[PDB]
């Protein structure tokens with residue numbers, strides 16, 4: 001009846017550029033808040049939070065300052081104290097050999113440790129283990145009982161077990177311990193074959209009243225902090241996770257793009273078809289694509305992402321014309337290079353509802369951000385109001401009139 | 404005769420991020436510097452520098468703060484003084500309230516207009532004096548240009564007109580005036596303009612290709628040339644302490660078969676040199692990088708040594724970002740060197756702070 005939440009790395013507040021806002025505490029806060037919202041009596045599931053100790057006092061303050069009971073534990077703390085089966089030291093061998101310094105080690109080496117430490121943890125202390133991405137189900141009842149075998153949850157994307165939820169009934173059960181050794185023989189990124197060293201039973205995550213969300217935070221790059229939630233556009237979701245970030249955080253938002261002159265999409269050298277823009281990339285009779293600019297004469301020759309082929313030809317236009325796959329001559333587009341904000345991104349995307357949502361929740365409205373004109377080289381420092389005048393977006397009536 | 408220099412756009416000093424440092428003034432200054440070099444006497448070819456009138460006071464100060472005599476003239480002043488040059492100002496207003504290519508187009512147009520109004524020579528600010536030779540720019544009798552770098556025909560970078568409103572120069576203008584395009588070299592085919600041997604004048608042209616949308620800004624274009632002479636030569640035309648988001652300043656962190664140090668990934672699983680743009684982690688300057696910072700990143704001890712002597716500040720902060728994992732690190736040049744583990748330059752910057 002124990003719940004092990006685990007976060008490896010710096011707190012999402014202090015790592016606002018490489019972490020998702022509330023990626024370590026939203027679930028545990030929502031869980032503990034929900035765990036003491038069903039059991040009218042005394043029956044409450046102990047919640048443990050394992051982190052590096054440099055953030056024990058910080059994480060411990062977060063959970064009581066949110067009004068929830070979560071005893072924060074340390075990674076090293078339960079290793080200083082060993083355990084008679086003490087020989088677990090393999091964990092620190094991997095721990096020291098990759099990430100003992102300050103700079104955030106490469107993410108994959110942390111997800112590796114999450115795997116290893118999660119398997120290790122249930123060997124020493126029985127109960128459940130959840131990723132912090134495991135919140136409580138909506139309008140359902142949370143039920144985390146205590147069974148008799150080591151069981152995990154269904155590998156949601158495959159047909160096997162998965163780390164996102166596990167359970168062990170006794171300290172060093174001859175089934176949890178054997179799974180650990182298979183990880184130590186070939187430790188690697190998400191090795192799902194340690195469970196294949198036996199026949200691990202399955203737990204239906206839905207039957208517990210909880211649910212898993214996949215943030216996929218290693219597959220390449222992503223949006224940082226609160227930007228990850230602003231893109232989901234559920235104002236409920238943003239308001240929920242806003243406590244775990246800063247509405248005023250400034251970040252280099254390489255995603256914040258916008259084209260200056262709109263160009264078109266079409267259809268073999270004249271190619272001066274009647275598009276209404278000053279330029280377009282058009283698909284030819286066959287072969288591939290071109291780049292045409294009516295103002296000069298260029299007709300550079302540059303299967304996916306842009307395909308106008310039947311009925312309407314020189315008629316379609318903008319969308320995600322980021323065709324900057326042809327890194328040849330192209331139209332001019334604007335990019336945030338430094339100190340952009342949520343409000344800045346909202347102003348660029350011409351999302352008046354988002355500009356209004358942020359301005360109400362307390363966002364400062366005239367902070368400066370650094371923008372560049374890519375190919376050109378023009379670097380401009382803009383307030384959200386100044387960006388809005390430049391981009392010609394009818395949202396200044398909101399920014400340039402107080403209220 | 405007369406030498407017509409032309410610059411369309413903002414002064415490279417005030418545009419250190421979209422222009423090359425000394426792309427507008429290095430060539431013309433060295434020209435005047437070379438014309439006065441000998442005991443020639445008093446006769447010296449008059450040099451004109453054509454720019455937008457807003458930067459007349461800036462340029463007039465720049466050439467005077469140097470030891471050169473260059474009469475700066477305004478593009479808009481001569482077009483208002485004119486006779487049917489409304490096409491020039493019509494092109495001026497409908498293009499240049501911008502895009503560099505739109506600019507180079509106006510350079511081509513205004514240069515042809517210039518030789519129609521005022522006879523003499525025209526050179527790009529890229530046209531320097533030749534090395535160890537003597538500059539000899541006489542006054543001939545026909546409209547003649549230099550030879551294009553590629554192929555075998557005429558070119559815009561060096562031209563000549565002998566008389567005001569020559570019946571051949573004016574005609575070349577008209578071929579451009581109603582088929583305007585980027586580098587329309589077919590206006591010269593409307594006759595056979597004689598050819599000028601660039602070596603016989605004592606001047607030489609360099610090509611920066613400033614409109615390839617991928618160049619280096621300000622002094623970074625010269626720091627990459629690795630010629631300590633070339634940077635020190637052009638360093639007056641920039642700022643050794645300028646801060647820029649230098650996205651080109653990138654670095655690596657690394658380098659069933661055997662693949663040694665990856666580049667497949669041994670430490671992890673993996674089921675699937677600079678050219679690395681692929682769907683491997685690296686660091687990139689995202690804000691306020693400097694020449695010294697780039698030198699520190701590139702592990703160019705000579706550049707770190709050359710810059711530190713020429714007066715570069717060594718304790719400015721720059722913003723760097725690990726690519727895959729959003730990580731922002733604020734670094735002094737020394738701190739970048741310790742982080743990147745650069746043996747000699749780290750000790751060199753630590754000892755220059757005390």
Ligand SMILES: O=c1ccn([C@@H]2O[C@H](COP(=O)(O)OP(=O)(O)O)[C@@H](O)[C@H]2O)c(=O)[nH]1
Nearest residue numbers: 006007008009114131132133214215216217
């Ligand atoms: O920097 C990180 C990233 C992930 N995790 C752990 O992994 C979970 C996040 O998993 P993610 O969504 O990134 O991957 P997926 O769940 O889609 O496999 C968190 O709740 C933590 O338990 C962590 O501790 N630190």
Ligand SMILES: O=c1ccn([C@@H]2O[C@H](COP(=O)(O)OP(=O)(O)O)[C@@H](O)[C@H]2O)c(=O)[nH]1
Nearest residue numbers: 409410411412510527528529610611612613
């Ligand atoms: O913004 C600009 C860029 C260029 N130029 C003029 O065009 C020349 C650029 O020549 P470049 O070497 O870049 O072109 P290339 O000759 O290599 O094609 C400069 O010297 C200037 O005379 C200009 O007036 N404004």
